[PDB]
Structures are given as C-alpha cells and as structure tokens.
Amino acid sequence: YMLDLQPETTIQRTPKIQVYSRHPAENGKSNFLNCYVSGFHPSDIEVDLLKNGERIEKVEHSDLSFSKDWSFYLLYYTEFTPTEKDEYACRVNHVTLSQPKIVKWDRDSGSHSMRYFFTSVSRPGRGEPRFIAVGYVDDTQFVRFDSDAASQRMEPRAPWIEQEGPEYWDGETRKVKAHSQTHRVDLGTLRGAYNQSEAGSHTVQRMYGCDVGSDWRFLRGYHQYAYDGKDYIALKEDLRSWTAADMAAQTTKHKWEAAHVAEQLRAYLEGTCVEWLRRYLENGKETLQRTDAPKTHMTHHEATLRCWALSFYPAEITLTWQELVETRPAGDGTFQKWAAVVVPSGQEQRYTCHVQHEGLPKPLTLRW
Amino acid sequence: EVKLVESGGGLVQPGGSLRLSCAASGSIFSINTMGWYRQTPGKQRDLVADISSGGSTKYGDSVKGRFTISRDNTKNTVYLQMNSLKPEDTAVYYCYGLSYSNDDYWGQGTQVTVS
C-alpha cells in the first residue's frame, strides 16, 4: 500500500559478480543457473549467460532494486540441465569496465518491514524516462511496475497478494503512476539545479517504508531521495524534519517544511504503512512468517577454509571467523552465503566458523 | 593461444559503408562466437555484433537495421557489413572470439572514422 497522496515535487560503482546454481549441481538433473550482479551504479548493465562460448537465448532477470548505499542489484537466471562436457559462465558489461568481464561457473522471532523502491532513469531523445518500482515485505518482493512493460499496471509478484480485488489494483496503479509523474518533473528540475545539459542520463531514487517488531508495533520509518546515487534529501529518524545533503537541496527542504509535507508522510509511515504490513503478514503467513534454517557445511604453504550456508530465509545472517561474499538469492525465495579465511596448512583446528541466523535455536560453531 | 587478424577499417563519408573482417587462427574447433565490440568515448567498449558458429546473431541497439554480421562456413572468419554510417559510429572496433570453454580473445582493433 503506497502513499495515497501524490508526493511533493522538488559517483560510479562497479558490479560484484557471482555465478552459481540454485541447487547443488547433479549431472542430468534439471537446475537453475544464476548470475547475481550487485553493488553497481549507474543502472545500465549488460548481462549474458554463456554455454560453451555461446549466448543462452531465453534468459530472465529480476526487477531492478537497490540497497541502503543506493547501489543496484539484479539476478539473471535461466533453466538448464548440466552435463559432463558443458561449460557455463556469465559476462557483464558496465560503464566502469574497460572490457566485459567473464565469470565461469565453478561447479566444485524477528522484526518485519514493508519497503517500496523507486528508480527513474532519463533517456535523452529516446522517449519518456524509464520508471521501475518494486514492493517488498521483509525480503520477499510482492509488487512491481515497469513503464516499459505491456500492462502499464501494478503487477503481483507473490501468491498472497493476488487475493486482492480490482479496487486495490486500480488504486495502486493510480498511485504508482503518480509517483511516476512526480519523478519525471524532478528529473528536469534537478537537471537545472545542477546545471546539466539536456543530453546526459540521470537517475532519481526514492525509498520509503516502515519497520515493526515481533509484536507488529511500529518501530522505525524511512523516506529517502537520491540523485545519481548521491543523497539529496531524506526524512530524519524522528519523521518530523528533513536532512538536506547540499546547497541545491535546501531550497526543497524549505519548500517542504513550508508545506508541512513531513506530517502527511509521518501519518502514512506510522499508521497506514503499519496497518497494511500487518494485513500482508497475515494473508501470506504461510510464506512471510516462515523461517528456513541454513543447511550449513564447510569447504577446504597456506590453505583456504570456506564456511557455506544455503537455502535459508530470511537473508539476515552472520558468518564470522575466530573474505565475506555478499548474500545472494537462490531464485526460489531462499538465499546463500559463504565466508573464507586463509590458514597455514596444519593449523586448521584452531579456527572456527560462527553462524548467527534468525531461524537457528542457538549459534552454530564449525571447525575442521 | 588464438590470434585474431583484423582488417577493413579506415575513413568513409557520412552515409557510406565499410566491410570489416576478422580471421581466427589456431584450431577451427577452438573458437565458437566471434564478433565486434567498439570503443566508446569514455572507458567501456560496447557490443556491435557477434555470431555463433551455428549462425545465431545479436546486435547492439544503435546498429540494428544498418549493420549485418556473417560467417564463412569453412574457415573461422566473420564479416561485418556496416551501412548508412554516421559520425557517431566513429570508434575503434575490436574483434573478439569466445573459446568453447568461455575464454575470450581480443584483437588489436581497427579505427573507423566517419567525417
């Protein structure tokens, strides 16, 4: 349930790549190949899945989203049955790369949240801007909009949300298009506020949502705005005043404090956001209220020790030694992760791997 | 391991055409996909066209309809027929090839200029 009131109007990071399967690879058994690109900016990226030096035809990808630091992440995936002679990889091109990078498939009780992410990217002399919006409950996405898609409607992405009727879907579509109209204006406004020509591409990112505790009582609320991956204006933790990033944003901070915009947002974040998060948790409780404990395992002058965690939900986890690769989506709703540490051969028993996850009775300690 | 010999670049008037060709050395069973990326004014190089040994093609949006890639059935040689060239097609065009183990090989490149 997005903001019902039309919103008030107004750095380059390279991607990290991971190529893996959904399930452990078994020759002759259907599986899924994944290429997870994360932590990059801007959003233009070319991703290919390769089979024996050839492009895989039917490849699908997830809807664009971004993290706290504003960097984007995506999951490219396709179905395949690995056999003996086949070799797979993923190729990624991005403005930060001299030439495309190839990565080969190396075969060998908690809080809750509702979040909405918005991304608008200008296309000089190529039509309207690209507008993408996705909704999340905890780590499960449940709605999406892509201005380039056919429907021009808010679309479901989880089973429980398909319950809702036409009144709900009509409203959400009316609201998302309003978010779109606002972003379209801001792009031109911010182009002027930064003295940029009408020839370059620019990005505006918006994120807002609310947190509740295990008692489903309001905990924290967010509302943030970013231009080209840099902070522009955000609502402070108390939801009563704004944080302006630079000199250009102070004009907007004063226009919004003059129009008391933070009061309407606080009411949404404290009330409506919470109320509909509660309804979602109940409607899809077979999904959103489950906890999948990680199936854990360990892999091994110097040698390498790697702790592995697979098929766990939610994504929040901690693997610590006594190299950490970003948590990645399995593609079926679960996640994976591993951590590594170097060790002189022989002294592999004086080290341990600790795993703090929300679904485990107590922490697990792993050693050779 | 593999050597990629390029030729066919140079200068052309706006609206003109050029034929690039790239020939792969080594074993004929050591190369599958071959094509061309091109240098951008910035740091990255963008896809222009490539083709699998079976003839599957993919083009970059900015050359769709104007550029055509083809391959010799016998030898590992590809051809890029560039038509209706514009100044914004000025760049160094790098031939490339993929081993059947997904190893990439890159040529020196050929400067293409449109007045």
Residue numbers in the entry:
A (entry chain A): 1 to 10, 25 to 122, 143 to 334, 340 to 361, 372 to 417
B (entry chain B): 3 to 117
From the paper:
Human MHC class I proteins, or human leukocyte antigens (HLA-I), bind peptides, mostly eight to 14 residues long, for presentation on the cell surface for recognition by cytotoxic immune cells. HLA-I proteins are composed of a polymorphic, integral-membrane heavy- or α-chain (α1, α2 and α3 ectodomains) and an invariant light chain, β2-microglobulin (β2m). In order to coordinate α/β chain co-expression and incorporate specific peptides during secretion from eukaryotic cells, a linked “single-chain trimer” (SCT) construct, coupling all three components into a single polypeptide, has been widely used. Success was ultimately achieved by isolating and recombinantly expressing the VHH domain from a novel, high-affinity, anti-β2m camelid antibody, allowing the crystallization of all SCTs tested.
The YML 14-mer peptide was found in two different, out-of-register conformations using two different C-terminal anchors depending on SCT design. When Y84A is introduced, the 14-mer binds with residues p2 and p10 as anchors (“binding mode 3”). The remaining C-terminal residues extended out of the groove through the now-unconstrained end. Our reported structural studies using this approach showed overall conservation of native peptide recognition by SCTs across most examples analyzed, with the important caveat that long peptides could adopt multiple or non-canonical binding modes due to register shifts in less-constrained SCTs. Verification of binding register is needed when designing SCTs with peptides longer that 10 residues, especially when peptides contain alternate anchor positions. While reasonable statistics for indexing and scaling in tetragonal lattices closely related to the triclinic supergroup could be obtained, molecular replacement solutions that adequately packed the AU could only be obtained when reindexed with a monoclinic lattice. However, these solutions ultimately proved incorrect when select chains overlapped and clashed with symmetry mates in these packings. These conflicts could only be overcome in P1.
